[PDB]
Design a protein around this nucleic acid. Sequence first.
DNA 1: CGGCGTACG
DNA 2: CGTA
DNA 3: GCCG
Length: 327
Amino acid sequence: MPAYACQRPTPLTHHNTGLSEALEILAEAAGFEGSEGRLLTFCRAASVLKALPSPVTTLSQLQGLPHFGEHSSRVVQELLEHGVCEEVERVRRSERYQTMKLFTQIFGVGVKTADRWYREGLRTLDDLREQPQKLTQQQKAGLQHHQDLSTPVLRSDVDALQQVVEEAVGQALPGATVTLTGGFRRGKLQGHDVDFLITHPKEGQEAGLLPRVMCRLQDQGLILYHQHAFERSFCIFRLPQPGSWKAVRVDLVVAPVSQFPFALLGWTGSKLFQRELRRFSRKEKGLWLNSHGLFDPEQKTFFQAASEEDIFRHLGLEYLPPEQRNA
DNA sequence: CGGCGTACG
DNA sequence: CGTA
DNA sequence: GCCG
Ligand SMILES: Nc1ncnc2c1ncn2[C@H]1C[C@H](O)[C@@H](COP(=O)(O)NP(=O)(O)OP(=O)(O)O)O1
Ligand SMILES: [Cl-]
Ligand SMILES: [Cl-]
Ligand SMILES: [Mg+2]
Ligand SMILES: [Mg+2]
Ligand code: NA
């Protein structure tokens, strides 16, 4: 088992679901406390189990696995022995965990805002609604739409949204294309949002595109919320439903075609897969990776890529299709 | 011990 | 600060 | 919390 998640296939469904979910509770709780190092270790240990070919049944099967030391091994041991890990269950029922989870789930609220509200004594969404002077416009929209945004987006919803986006994109710039990214491209059947990447085959023609797209979607009455020159848009869309509609989060990103492979790779995720890939690039290969390119800081040159396959090759990694990037 | 991804709105 |  |  290699030490970086980008060195191994990770399928969406696997053989250690309960164990990985427990470790991910501890990771999440570490994040709520600002302990990014412990969050990473617990996330990485969970991802190792996702990559295994069969269930862990005995503690000895953790020997030699990367990111399993005393703490993660004890969590697994308790689950194998008793079906429950007391530390995990204490986190789950804690007022701190439940409230930080509730607040950070709001669009416009991160850990730092949630923690301040927590320290001020706030505990429920209605506590927040009562004191709207303390809310940004973004947070007001996130709170108004919270119930709909808590409902999974279905793969069956995505095709209708993509057609609507393509219509607006085609008027804004004929020839421009829309690619489905994020978790749906990794094979997820549900999501928290829909992520789309937009480009044009003629380098430079995509400049200034996203404002043109957004004002056309707004004119069609489809935009319940957006922040408005820009290249990323974090929107709330009106999605038709039988006899009604529901609010859905949609992310739009524009990239020039020269950067499209890097943007596709970055926006297809998973989040941990990309952090691990960028960590691998820099620490193992001395190259700096982001959603725009891959930089050699010694030659001061950028690596041209025409495909995701090119990028894996330039990093010395076996290619992984999106379905195997579910770290 | 230092390091832990890297951007844009 | 928020967001991907 | 774990790796190197
Ligand atoms: N902090 C981060 N660092 C690096 N890449 C990140 C990132 N956050 C997101 N990405 C990249 C990788 C992510 O896969 C992609 C989309 O971000 P989401 O839409 O927040 N997450 P997904 O679509 O995977 O699942 P779902 O929406 O169902 O929760 O952007
Ligand atoms: Cl930490
Ligand atoms: Cl980036
Ligand atoms: Mg998504
Ligand atoms: Mg998104
Ligand atoms: Na949030």
